[PDB]
């Protein structure tokens, strides 16, 4: 099993930490607020009190010995990008940082970060889809064109059937499940009927289904 | 006009204003931050500078136009939550929130806001379970149970073809769809062949991709 | 005995604290201030330093097993609120909750506060009747029109008896009770006498009385 | 005309504000705050921002024609008795003041305010005489041993006639009124009845109308 | 001996205390802050860290015992009040307090201070008095006309005799004082005779000293 | 003209400039604090607020023109010292400047200072001087051996005559004055008499006269 | 034209924009705190208050125009960092900055700074050889084992010759420059004296210079 | 060897500290913060935490053993100027001290200060001769009209001889060193050739060395 240390018990860290633990990997919890520690105490397999920027307890918690480090520290930006310098001077394999804004992202990519993530950026991407389409539920973009969206079913596709909604030649998208009262529904046959409320999955273009969402439902 | 307001311009709803302006809808940037309005003035149809705990310059920003009100406010859990109170009072029908921690979304859904939202901790899990399987890029849950996901195909599935790495018989999945050099194929044919480094979409059982992971790939 | 907790040592729920201890009954005082505990130790059975917004001390306080909690919390609204959720989710009876404004009284209602006291408010109109008329000593309201009133007796009303002072026809009320030098007197016998500077408690409807007051004294 | 001005626009001053400006007194609302005053400027005949310490800005204020000032600055102690000091040296008739606690009564007292008051303090008496006993609503301390109290009937009481039950005899105390319904019965006839959830008002000893409410309800 | 207590050990405090323990008295030294105790603590009889406005610290320092209390608390009015007020209620003799302005002699006069002192104040005047007349070394006024001056002898009184110098007949003063070089003469004879940068004390008129001042030297 | 400059409105120097400007002195009040100078604004010539530590502000002020110019700063010892070095360099007369402590005296010694005073200090020694001994009322100090001292007469001299009271042949002092009833007595004949009340000079060493406190009155 | 940017107007950049405007150069002097700016504009071509981490106001400032951009940011780190982010996105030729300590230099160093200076721990170096030996005044490094150094010369050397002081073949050095009561002495003869307290410009191996120093003078 | 006592860990005084132990100097490090001191602890023979302004744990650290004392204390001024005050009156034989500006100078220099340095000007100083001349790698003034610097040779000079580069008869100066791929040439023969980016040490007038730049490099 790989051994994984996260820095900064924020949100975002903090369900990593909590996430990763439940997966039963080794995970350290880092951070330098003693409260923090007792919180995710139940939560990690070690739990340690500790100033990331210092390099004399930093190499006290035997960091160089992990193959991935997760830098989740956001407020305090000089305690993200100096933690990420000793931990990339300590040659260390994989390093993953939480960034603030843009110029942090830089500064993160000029010392050596193996990956920058962007939490809130990217979920306020995709809310903001779903708020100018409460038909959406979920989604993932396979490229700039292509996506797979889960649907909210309306009145509208109420006892419809998959042939009655002709996607394939239509509008060149399909279905790909159906769920219904919790219970799924995979690679649905074409007499398989789709009721209100139910969750629907379709593949295809993204104005091809807006198109579907238009006309369609 | 479906109009839309962003309170609170954090990295969160900042995101939301900028990508809902992106659309091309009407959208009200609202901080109690000079600097924060100003940023995002180019970002946004319209940019006030107010607090919203006021209910008094609630109603002069014309907030009873508006359908859908976003309250991205996080540090200041008594600004959240005292601004959602005034906007459920103020019989707005959908009122967005973001939430801080599990007693804040308790509060929140007692007082009637529509849609809860936790955009660090939901990232969290999300990042995580591509630090533990690097294989996967991302992905999307039908259930408790069932999951598409997007692979990053490695060399023992260079040069493989659909009908030669069976998954309907042999892990009881399905390939949705190939990425490669940017060039999309959807519902591929079982003479369709997957390259190394190329974006592989398969879906099934959570557990059943994870043994495709292991023996497959 | 009923076993009462008293949350928030401030000048209300120490008087509340100080007043019930000294009835006989089993009250706690809880504070996040040491030196609060030390002011009130004297007037309560027990006496604990703790953070009511911290689910661990407060099932260390044994919380769950009183009947009565009081939270005296006015200044930090967040830690007011927070206390009476985190009461509401541990089932407690009756939980009495302080208010600091309009706003407070809202998500206190909305989160099952069973009781909301405004004590500076509702003091703020009995002074009020007091200074508009001087010779009104204390109160209360038996409805929007009808109230008992105790009065400081002037010179006009000096050495005059209670059927000279026609009030069960002449204005509609009833002289309910004399207090003379401290001697009280109960259901005043028609003969009896009222001299200046007595307490004169007198029932009847609000406009009325104040028509005995203009005229009568 | 009857002046009357309020310094310290608190919860208790704020309430004596507001409540004298609905008796439609002439009321000055006086707040070192803008916020404060600008709240409350609905609320008064004349609003004014002023640091009530300062002897110019003092009588800038035209307070020489104010017969009732009162002080209910509460927090800063320093503020509340410098006011009311030079208050007394403006040769201001009559000087209320909200006061802190014992010693702060103390220093008031020999600086020469004419009523010294304590909201918070006299409210958790009152509330806790609640706290013990479930049946008491309201009240009024006529002395040391003498007391009227509401009372909210029980089942034991419902359908009851006033001569079914004897307090006069049986408990020396004497009903006052019922309150059924909201409808209201004053000094009502031995043949009156009483339904359950009505109001009671009962008039006599202490121990006399706690004896009834163990035995009689 | 008589028992002297010292609470604020400022400027002025400590000088007193210094002073008084080099009489050979027994005097407290009492501070809040730590610093301040271990400065003085070679200064005082006893030294001891406490604040003054706790009623216990109060007690457990046996203040009672004392016939002089000595308040030296400048910037903080409100320690200074409060500890005047228990010293006051603890019917302490002689209670002598430093004051910062007008209105805190005021309050002090009212609770029952024994004498109040203007430190700051009363040496800015006599410094000022130095300023406009630099002739003038130091002073004592007998009256508001009578006084008693040590000045510094010019050239112009240089070899100059007593008798040759007529203060009693030309401008109603007396010569007290020649200070010579260190040597001291007291009542000096009419043969005496001044030099100049010698300390001259002169008694009589205000108006007449600066007659003498002006035409003599 | 004899132009006075008083920077730093304090204590001390509040009563400088206000006695300074009593005695029809050309007076400039300089202070950084707006309050303060709106304050002695009616007891100076002309107060201007400016920051003494700016060489630009000084000379603004026209301070070439004052030949005696009184730091009078306290607390920020920094501004005290970098003001005093400031009026040397700019080739000030006389500079006089409060000191808050030894070590302050010495650097501002070294830098030029014309004198240094230490108000509290030097009213500390004299307070005590009359706690220790309450017969004395104010003195003046002649030399280390030499003193002048007010007394007020007590009891045992009550209707004493002066060759009654020898003083020149049994202690080696000599009366100076008699105060009665506000009524001055100088240079006082043998046949004069002392009441009670009344205020007493006598001139002397400093043991002769403390033994005539003890035996004399 | 050459034209020079200094950002941090703090002592080593407030000295590097002095003195470059001194040469006659084009120099633009940019703070944050408007007193440093006014402090600098007397020693600027351009003085402009402006915050450096803000795109907008440095490119109000025509920052393009500049070729030399000085970074002389020391406490605040972030600004430090940012600031130079900011240059080199804005393609900015020759960007020097003042660094902190090792740390600093790094994270510099990654993203693209020209020239990093130590200017403290430069000076520290340099003040230490001189307390060691109080023979140099100051000197120059060659190389790791080669500098020229400026000795204050010794009795020992007094009135000396060239000739009779041998170092080119006694100690392997060469007398640079004689510098006697002001009075320059370039590549001296061998005739050329030295008197004590003159300057000696002494070049060779710093072992070498040493045993000069020990044996020599 | 000698003692040196080095207060102020700061970049300048830290610099100082450690190279002077690495000289191996018996040198004490005193800082008032605990985590400067456990910095430089393994660069000093003794580290002590202590505040200099104490007069106490000045003779505790038993600082007047010590014939070198150095104040590196920067920003409070305070601290500084108290710190030479005490050591003066220890009688400490060399004081130097690091000075924050022209004022701060000045005081030093009047308490009696053995050496005051500038360390950022003068670095500001010699880092703008580097930026008008990007030739110049370093020097050293002789006086205000001689100096020799270090160039850095560009193409133009490249293969040429110092036979060929007259410079004794036309510019008056004479080549000192050249530095080639490190090796280093001391006093190079006239025959000797100097290629490009070699290290060029050159002695002359100032103008005239700026003169050999403009027309022979
Ligand atoms: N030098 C440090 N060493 C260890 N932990 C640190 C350090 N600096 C910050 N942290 C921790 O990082 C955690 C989260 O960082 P912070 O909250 O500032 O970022 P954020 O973006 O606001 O968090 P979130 O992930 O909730 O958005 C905090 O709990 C803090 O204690
Ligand atoms: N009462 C208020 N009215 C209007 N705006 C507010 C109010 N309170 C806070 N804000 C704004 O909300 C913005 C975001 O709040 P905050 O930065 O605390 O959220 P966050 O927890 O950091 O979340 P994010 O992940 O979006 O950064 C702030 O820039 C602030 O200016
Ligand atoms: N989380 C907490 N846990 C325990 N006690 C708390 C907490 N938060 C506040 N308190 C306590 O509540 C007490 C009173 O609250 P606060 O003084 O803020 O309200 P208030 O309305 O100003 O009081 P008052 O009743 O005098 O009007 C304080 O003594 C404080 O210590
Ligand atoms: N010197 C002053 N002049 C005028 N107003 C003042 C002054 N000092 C305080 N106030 C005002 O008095 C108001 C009430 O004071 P404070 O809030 O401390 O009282 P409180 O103890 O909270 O009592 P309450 O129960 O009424 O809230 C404050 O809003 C403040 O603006
Ligand atoms: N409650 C208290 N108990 C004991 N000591 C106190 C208390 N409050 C203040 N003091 C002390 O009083 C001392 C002097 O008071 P402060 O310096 O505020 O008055 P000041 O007028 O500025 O002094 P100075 O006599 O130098 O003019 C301080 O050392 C402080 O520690
Ligand atoms: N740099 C400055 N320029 C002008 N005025 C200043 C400066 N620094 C302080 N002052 C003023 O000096 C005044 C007196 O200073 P401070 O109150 O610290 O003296 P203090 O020690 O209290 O002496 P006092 O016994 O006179 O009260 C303050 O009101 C302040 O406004
Ligand atoms: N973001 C910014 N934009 C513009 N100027 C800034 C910014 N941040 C800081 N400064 C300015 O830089 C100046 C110098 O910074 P600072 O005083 O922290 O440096 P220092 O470490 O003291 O170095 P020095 O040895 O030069 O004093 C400050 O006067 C400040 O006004
Ligand atoms: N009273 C004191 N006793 C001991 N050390 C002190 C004292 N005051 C300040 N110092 C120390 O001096 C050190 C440096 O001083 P400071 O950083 O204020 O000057 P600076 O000019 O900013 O430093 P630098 O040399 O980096 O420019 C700090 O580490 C601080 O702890
Ligand atoms: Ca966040
Ligand atoms: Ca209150
Ligand atoms: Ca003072
Ligand atoms: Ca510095």
Same mark, same amino acid.
């Given at each position: %099993?790989? *051994?994984?240390? @996260?820095?900064?018990?924020?949100?975002?860290?903090?369900?990593?930490? $909590?996430?990763?633990?439940? =997966?039963?990997?080794?995970?350290?919890? @880092?951070?330098?607020? &003693? &409260?923090? !520690?007792?919180?995710?105490?139940?939560?990690?397999?070690?739990?340690?009190?500790?100033?990331?920027?210092?390099?004399?307890?930093?190499?006290?918690?035997?960091?160089?010995?992990?193959?991935? @480090?997760?830098?989740?520290?956001?407020?305090?930006? *000089?305690?993200?990008?100096?933690?990420?310098?000793?931990?990339? &001077?300590?040659?260390?394999?994989?390093?993953?940082? $939480?960034? *603030?804004?843009?110029?942090?992202?830089? !500064?993160?990519? $000029?010392?050596?970060?193996?990956?920058? +993530?962007?939490?809130? $950026?990217?979920?306020? @991407?995709?809310? #903001?889809?779903?708020?100018?389409?409460? %038909?959406?539920? %979920?989604?993932?973009?396979?490229?700039?064109?292509?996506?797979?969206? &889960?649907?909210?079913?309306?009145?509208?596709?109420?006892?419809?059937?998959?042939?009655?909604?002709?996607?394939? #030649?239509?509008?060149?998208?399909?279905?790909? #499940?159906?769920?219904?009262?919790?219970?799924?529904?995979?690679?649905?046959?074409?007499?398989?009927? +789709?009721?209100?409320?139910?969750?629907?999955?379709? =593949?295809?273009?993204?104005?091809?289904?807006?198109?579907?969402?238009?006309?369609?439902?």
């Amino acid at each position: %099993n790989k *051994q994984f240390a @996260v820095i900064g018990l924020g949100r975002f860290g903090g369900s990593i930490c $909590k996430e990763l633990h439940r =997966m039963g990997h080794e995970v350290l919890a @880092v951070d330098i607020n &003693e &409260e923090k !520690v007792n919180a995710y105490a139940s939560y990690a397999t070690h739990a340690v009190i500790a100033n990331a920027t210092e390099e004399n307890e930093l190499l006290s918690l035997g960091i160089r010995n992990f193959e991935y @480090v997760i830098v989740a520290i956001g407020a305090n930006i *000089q305690a993200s990008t100096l933690t990420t310098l000793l931990l990339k &001077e300590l040659d260390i394999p994989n390093i993953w940082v $939480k960034a *603030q804004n843009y110029y942090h992202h830089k !500064v993160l990519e $000029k010392i050596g970060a193996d990956r920058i +993530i962007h939490p809130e $950026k990217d979920m306020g @991407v995709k809310i #903001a889809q779903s708020l100018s389409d409460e %038909n959406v539920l %979920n989604y993932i973009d396979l490229s700039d064109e292509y996506s797979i969206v &889960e649907l909210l079913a309306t009145r509208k596709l109420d006892s419809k059937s998959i042939i009655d909604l002709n996607v394939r #030649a239509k509008y060149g998208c399909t279905i790909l #499940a159906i769920k219904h009262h919790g219970d799924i529904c995979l690679s649905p046959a074409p007499e398989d009927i +789709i009721r209100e409320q139910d969750c629907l999955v379709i =593949m295809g273009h993204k104005k091809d289904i807006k198109r579907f969402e238009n006309e369609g439902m």
